[PDB]
Amino acid sequence: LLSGTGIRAALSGITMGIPVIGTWMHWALFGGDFPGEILIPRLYALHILLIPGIILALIGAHLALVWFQKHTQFPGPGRTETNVVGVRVMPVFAVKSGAFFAMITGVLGLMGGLLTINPIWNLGPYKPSQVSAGSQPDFYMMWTDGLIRLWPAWEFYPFGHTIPQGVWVAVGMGLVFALLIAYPFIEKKVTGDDAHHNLLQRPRDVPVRTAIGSMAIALYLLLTFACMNDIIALKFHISLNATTWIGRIGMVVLPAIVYFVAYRWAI
Amino acid sequence: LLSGTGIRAALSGITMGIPVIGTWMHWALFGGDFPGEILIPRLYALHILLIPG
Amino acid sequence: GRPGESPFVKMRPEDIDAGGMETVFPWRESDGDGTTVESEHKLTEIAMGVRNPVMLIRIKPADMHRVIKRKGQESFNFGELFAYTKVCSHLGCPSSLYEQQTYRILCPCHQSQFDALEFAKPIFGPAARALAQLPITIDEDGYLVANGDFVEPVGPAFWERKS
Amino acid sequence: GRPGESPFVKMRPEDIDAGGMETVFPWRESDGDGTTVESEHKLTEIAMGVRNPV
Amino acid sequence: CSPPGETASSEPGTTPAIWTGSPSPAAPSGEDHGGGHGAGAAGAGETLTAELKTADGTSVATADFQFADGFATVTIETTTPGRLTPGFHGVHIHSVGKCEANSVAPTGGAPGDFNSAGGHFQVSGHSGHPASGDLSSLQVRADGSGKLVTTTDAFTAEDLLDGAKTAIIIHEKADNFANIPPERYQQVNGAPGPDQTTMATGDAGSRVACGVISAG
Amino acid sequence: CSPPGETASSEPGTTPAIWTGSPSPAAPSGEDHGGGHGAGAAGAGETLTAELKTADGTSVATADFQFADGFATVTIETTTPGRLTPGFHGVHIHSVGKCEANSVAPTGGAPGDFNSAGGHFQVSGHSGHPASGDLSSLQVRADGSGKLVTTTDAFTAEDLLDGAKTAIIIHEKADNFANIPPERYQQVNGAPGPDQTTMATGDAGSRVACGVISAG
Amino acid sequence: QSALLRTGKQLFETSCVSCHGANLQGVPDRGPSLIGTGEAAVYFQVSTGRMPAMRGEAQAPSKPPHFDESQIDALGAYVQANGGGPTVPRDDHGAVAQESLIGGDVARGGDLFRLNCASCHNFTGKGGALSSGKYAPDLGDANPAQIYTAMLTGPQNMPKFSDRQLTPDEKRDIVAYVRESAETPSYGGYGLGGFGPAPEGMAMWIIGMVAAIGVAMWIGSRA
Ligand SMILES: CC(C)=CCC/C(C)=C/CC/C(C)=C/CC/C(C)=C/CC/C(C)=C/CC/C(C)=C/CC/C(C)=C/CC/C(C)=C/CC/C(C)=C/CC1=C(C)C(=O)c2ccccc2C1=O
Ligand SMILES: CCCCCCCCCCCCCCCC(=O)O[C@H](COC(=O)CCCCCCC[C@@H](C)CCCCCCCCC)COP(=O)(O)O[C@H]1[C@H](O)[C@H](O)[C@H](O)[C@@H](O)[C@@H]1O
Ligand SMILES: CCCCCCCCCCCCCCCC(=O)O[C@H](COC(=O)CCCCCCC[C@@H](C)CCCCCCCCC)COP(=O)(O)O[C@H]1[C@H](O)[C@H](O)[C@H](O)[C@@H](O)[C@@H]1O
Ligand code: HEC
Ligand code: HEC
Ligand SMILES: CCc1nc2ccc(Cl)cn2c1C(=O)NCc1ccc(N2CCC(c3ccc(OC(F)(F)F)cc3)CC2)cc1
Ligand SMILES: CCc1nc2ccc(Cl)cn2c1C(=O)NCc1ccc(N2CCC(c3ccc(OC(F)(F)F)cc3)CC2)cc1
Ligand code: FES
């Protein structure tokens, strides 16, 4: 029910909202309308085989680059742009890396035992009519959901056509990703740093970038908590409209305050 | 029909013929008797991801 | 919610009492109870129809004078009964939540509020188009039947809409 | 092999003539024809019974 | 932006009219039918009911007959608990289908629920013995109800829908039919034979009830 | 190796005995219902048929009566097409359920199919007017069949299974019950009243048929 | 009863006449009319303690009952006599039936809940937020009779599920599902409330991330 309504909102509604091919993309993804009988098998294929494979290939590339673009380092006593100060792989680094994998696995096992995650049995089978009040996705999509909630219901109606407000979030993601994927190039275009940098920089030593990152984290947190504005209002007694408007004013004000504070804090 | 009878012969009969654990292996593989309701999804997992990997 | 048999039963106006909301579905005479195999699949289609669910809300008589209607939907209400699609006009989540004494159809996916008294138009949240109102009336034997189809598409909006 | 309804029918000795073979299944009175939703699955279980056919 | 179409237009509206659905062309290719039978007439099907009314309109009973497998199956439910006196009632098939208070087809005294065009509703060629115009008797005990059947198949659904609508007439007498043999009994005229008035159809006191058989 | 079981030439075998399955136990106790009704007796359900046998053992009719919702539903299908002459047979309900060729309860002439211990099978407390024991004419045309019902509920399923099994008797007379008025009609003795022989139960010629009502 | 009505009137005349007129007609813009609300409405509203409301705000909250069971019955009978309406269910003894209100079926009760109740409360009966300062409270505390009467009378911004929408059988079924969900332990460890994604993500970012980062700080160095 929860994941089904999440599919309905995100995939169906947003894909259908996209102007030119939105309905076509929706019918291709679902092989028809939303309850299409080929959705879950397709998601299974994408989730157990395709996307994990792509992620594994990209992780292989990532680790290969880090291995051969030998890891960067923080400035220090004997540390320079032309050396790596630390511990050789075999004696020390391998042992501590394996021990860290063991302890991370232990933390995850302890959580899997003692903490309940996605108790689907409480969540009846998905039906288009049944609903729940919470209706959030996992925390990594809560920013998406909060961006939906806080964006003020702005739609446009061209000649015999509709551009639903959902479209906005898609553009949002674009920009977000378009800014995340491309950020180092914007940094080097603005700052002009085109030098081979091997010594890391303490965040305090880059007040502008530290402020920008704090601003981005503030916006992400605001959106994530906006997705939880339903639960926040329920538990912390704040009117739902008040939380929605706190988020609406915040997604413009809180980033500015956080940027200013983080800049002054770094300095 | 063809592939189903192939499964019935090989995977079911041979697996359940093995002396010590034949029936146990058959029930672990099929989750029950031969036409068990978990066979094809498990073969799909073995055939798209596991064995290809 | 009976386990399989007769999941849908005809409905009567007296059943809904002032300030009461009930989810209703488009049950045909042919789509009989789920006793047989031919049925129980038509009924499954009705249940799984994304746009099939509707909410019928009985506006309190004291609040009747406050109702503001929609052009072309002035007679859609049968007396004090109003049928509005449950599917949100924003991204197509069900708008199940109903608040009486304030007449607010709330969608919890994105916390969107439509005014039930005035035609179900969004008065808060992301939604910008009113919920589609289903024409309703009572047929022979006094059972509530749709008085026709939605005058507009009912799910969430898309490119080829409002023409 | 009727499509769904009454897939299994009672059988009588004279139906099979000398030198004839017939595949038969263990049909019960309770496992009525396949109209009902409750039925159509007892019958499906009989059909899928790996050891059922005779 | 706002969507193009909204607002009431200051038009009040009207209450929806009672829905009257049409037959199903898309689902049904033709018009479905109910009871089936030979029905060698204009058409009656395998379902035909009737209602027994009293002199003041009170529901005396409710008869219903229909052809099933070439032999008409009939039954009459009780319409009132104390409608029937603790005695015997003579049920007969009347040629007249009108359950008027008092109608007389011939020239003479009009009896209550006596609109029948003669005695018993026999076949067109049958005018002698008690043909299909005769039906099972209506015996009533202290309970005051009607539930009992007989075997009267001289007429069928094909002959039931004749030129004149038939009906069921409930009398207030038993079933004897001149049971007094000519050897011992005698008539008012001294002849050992019975009276033709009682032989044409079951004759009794004022008619107990009259119910139209035309799918009443 | 060979499997241990192996052949058996000896003991050629026996023809399989006809299978007689046991009733489904409490686990699958669910089974088709035999009928529901008031059943104010030792138990008869909502289904009880009867077969009308003639003097030569050839079925003439097949009566039936069963409780449905407190009011008995009945229908007497014809057993033969030429069994009934083109006329009316005096219907009656006999207290005696033995449709013997010739047997009379009292000391006297034993009319054919007249095993009834009296006239009509009335109620236990009923001994006067023609109670549910009395029945009217069953009509047969040139076709010779009987199928028609009435309303006569002086009894019920509770009284159906009396101490002595009841039956349905077909006489050779209509349903009149002294239709000749006492004002002008007269009997052998001249008394304006009717004869008790025709009043107690439907009296006619030789019995047309007699069928036991106990699930015949 | 005569004495019951007398006691109900006594309690009413000094606890709620300010909100509702002495004739039970609501005071304008203070409280609504109690004519026709019924004994069920009074029982649910006062047993939950909401009615000595003590403020006019967006949502009257639940609070400790201000009257005891006998006084609850007295008030409810008073209101029932005045207007006449729904009555709280009772068992053979005469007390407010609570055990008898647990319907046998739960899967059907679960479907009923998800279609009707979960809309605003939760998948598993937890609370939910509403339009402006309102919310749907958690169902854990409400006893079977209170859940039944809440369905039978929509207190405020609750749809009123008459006996015809949800026949006593369906209401008992929903009560059974509510109680089962409320008292059923969360299989799979401490159930973080009932809301999945939000408590689950919060617990990740606190427990798992603090643990992982602390272990990294322990294993790693600082410089
Ligand atoms: C769009 C948007 C963010 C709108 C505003 C909504 C919002 C976040 C409002 C603030 C919420 C708060 C802090 C309410 C308390 C009252 C209040 C506002 C006081 C003044 C605030 C202030 C600046 C005080 C000065 C000191 C100070 C910083 C106090 C903060 C107090 C708090 C709450 C600190 C901890 C922060 C915190 C954990 C907030 C809740 C975050 C979430 C999403 C928790 C999710 C969660 C829930 C909802 C469970 O039910 C649960 C049940 C069982 C196990 C786990 C959980 C769980 O993790
Ligand atoms: C990380 C998050 C940080 C927050 C970031 C954002 C900061 C910007 C704050 C912007 C504040 C904007 C407030 C306005 C909001 C608004 O416009 O809505 C009003 C309700 O005003 C209010 O409550 C005032 C609320 C102001 C509180 C903001 C306080 C800051 C908090 C949130 C900071 C703590 C953060 C802790 C984070 C924890 C760590 C995170 C890792 C009315 O609503 P309503 O309720 O419907 O009232 C109806 C009438 O309308 C109608 O007429 C009338 O008739 C009535 O019917 C009435 O009902
Ligand atoms: C490495 C992970 C270690 C995790 C620890 C594991 C602990 C195991 C606990 C014991 C076994 C599992 C219990 C399952 C049974 C169970 O679920 O536990 C409830 C409790 O639940 C609560 O209330 C909260 C009580 C407060 C104590 C627990 C708090 C633990 C948190 C702090 C750990 C997670 C981290 C979160 C940090 C978030 C902070 C952010 C800064 C208890 O019943 P109850 O109290 O009555 O719940 C009400 C129903 O009754 C009623 O209907 C219902 O409607 C409700 O009202 C319900 O509350
Ligand atoms: C302060 C104003 C009060 C007082 C002291 C009482 N009530 Fe009443 N009441 C009040 C409001 C604002 C409302 C509507 C919203 C809400 O209930 O919180 C009500 C409603 C009721 C109802 C519900 C009627 C229904 O659901 O149909 C009942 C049954 C009721 N009130 C009764 C009641 C009783 C018995 C009181 C004394 C114990 C009482 N109220 C006090 C406002 C106020
Ligand atoms: C949003 C519409 C809405 C729906 C639909 C709804 N509820 Fe509620 N519910 C509420 C609100 C609002 C309250 C607060 C009542 C009050 O404040 O007096 C409430 C209160 C309750 C309570 C009182 C619990 C307590 O502790 O006070 C129960 C029990 C309850 N609901 C159960 C149900 C059930 C069962 C259903 C399905 C028949 C249902 N709800 C459907 C909104 C709703
Ligand atoms: C909606 C918010 C939400 N509400 C709830 C309520 C309850 C629950 Cl449980 C979960 N939620 C969620 C939720 O989880 N949202 C996650 C999400 C959102 C959007 C997408 N999008 C992929 C790209 C599509 C797209 C865009 C551009 C394209 O053009 C291209 F790229 F060029 F081809 C093609 C496709 C739009 C949908 C995925 C996940
Ligand atoms: C049977 C022949 C046949 N007839 C038809 C008719 C029609 C059609 Cl279409 C196809 N056929 C086929 C057919 O295709 N046969 C392929 C086949 C054969 C055997 C196995 N076996 C692998 C080992 C398992 C095993 C045994 C021991 C083990 O022990 C260990 F290793 F130590 F763990 C582990 C696994 C048993 C099954 C698979 C496929
Ligand atoms: S899903 Fe309904 S408001 Fe967006």
TrEMBL record, chain B:
Annotated binding of heme b 2, by residue: H47
The organism of origin for this protein: Mycolicibacterium smegmatis (strain ATCC 700084 / mc(2)155) (Mycobacterium smegmatis)
Localization, UniProt: Cell membrane
Protein task: Cytochrome b subunit of the cytochrome bc1 complex, an essential component of the respiratory electron transport chain required for ATP synthesis. The bc1 complex catalyzes the oxidation of ubiquinol and the reduction of cytochrome c in the respiratory chain. The bc1 complex operates through a Q-cycle mechanism that couples electron transfer to generation of the proton gradient that drives ATP synthesis. The cytochrome b subunit contains two ubiquinol reactive sites: the oxidation (QP) site and the reduction (QN) site.
Domain of life, source organism: Bacteria
Protein name in the entry: Cytochrome bc1 complex cytochrome b subunit
Part of the full-length chain shown: 165 to 217 of 546
Gene name tied to this protein: qcrB
Known partners and oligomeric status: The cytochrome bc1 complex is composed of a cytochrome b (QcrB), the Rieske iron-sulfur protein (QcrA) and a diheme cytochrome c (QcrC) subunit.
Residues spanning the membrane: 9-31
UniProtKB/TrEMBL annotation, chain C:
Binding positions ([2Fe-2S] cluster 1): C88, H90, L91, C93, C107, H110, S112
Binding site for [2Fe-2S] cluster 3: C88, C93, H110
One Gene Ontology cellular component annotation held by this UniProt entry: plasma membrane
Subcellular location: Cell membrane
Residue ranges of every copy of the Rieske domain listed in the record: 51-145
Binding site for [2Fe-2S] cluster 2: C88, H90
Covalent S-S links between cysteines: C93-C109
GO molecular function, one term: metal ion binding
Major localization class: membrane
Entry keywords, A to Z: 2Fe-2S, Cell membrane, Disulfide bond, Electron transport, Iron, Iron-sulfur, Membrane, Metal-binding, Oxidoreductase, Respiratory chain, Transmembrane, Transmembrane helix, Transport
Function: Iron-sulfur subunit of the cytochrome bc1 complex, an essential component of the respiratory electron transport chain required for ATP synthesis. The bc1 complex catalyzes the oxidation of menaquinol and the reduction of cytochrome c in the respiratory chain. The bc1 complex operates through a Q-cycle mechanism that couples electron transfer to generation of the proton gradient that drives ATP synthesis.
UniProt similarity note: Belongs to the Rieske iron-sulfur protein family.
Stated name of the protein: Cytochrome bc1 complex Rieske iron-sulfur subunit
Organism per entry: Mycolicibacterium smegmatis (strain ATCC 700084 / mc(2)155) (Mycobacterium smegmatis)
Part of the whole protein covered: 259 to 421 of 421
UniProtKB/TrEMBL annotation, chain D:
Subcellular location per the Swiss-Prot or TrEMBL entry: Cell membrane
Leader sequence residues: none
Function: Iron-sulfur subunit of the cytochrome bc1 complex, an essential component of the respiratory electron transport chain required for ATP synthesis. The bc1 complex catalyzes the oxidation of menaquinol and the reduction of cytochrome c in the respiratory chain. The bc1 complex operates through a Q-cycle mechanism that couples electron transfer to generation of the proton gradient that drives ATP synthesis.
Family, similarity comment: Belongs to the Rieske iron-sulfur protein family.
The protein's name in its UniProt record: Cytochrome bc1 complex Rieske iron-sulfur subunit
Native source organism of the sequence: Mycolicibacterium smegmatis (strain ATCC 700084 / mc(2)155)
Lineage of the organism: Bacteria, Bacillati, Actinomycetota, Actinomycetes, Mycobacteriales
Gene: qcrA
Full protein stretch here: 259 to 312 of 421
From TrEMBL, chain G:
Binding site for heme c 4: H20, Q45, Q156
Broad EC category: translocase
Binding residues for heme c 1: C16, C19, H20, Q156
Positions annotated to bind heme c 5: H20, M51
TM spans (from-to): 202-220
Catalytic activity: a quinol + 2 Fe(III)-[cytochrome c](out) = a quinone + 2 Fe(II)-[cytochrome c](out) + 2 H(+)(out)
Protein's name according to its UniProt entry: Cytochrome bc1 complex cytochrome c subunit
Originating species: Mycolicibacterium smegmatis (strain ATCC 700084 / mc(2)155) (Mycobacterium smegmatis)
Lineage: Bacteria, Bacillati, Actinomycetota, Actinomycetes, Mycobacteriales
Full-sequence portion shown in this chain: 72 to 294 of 294
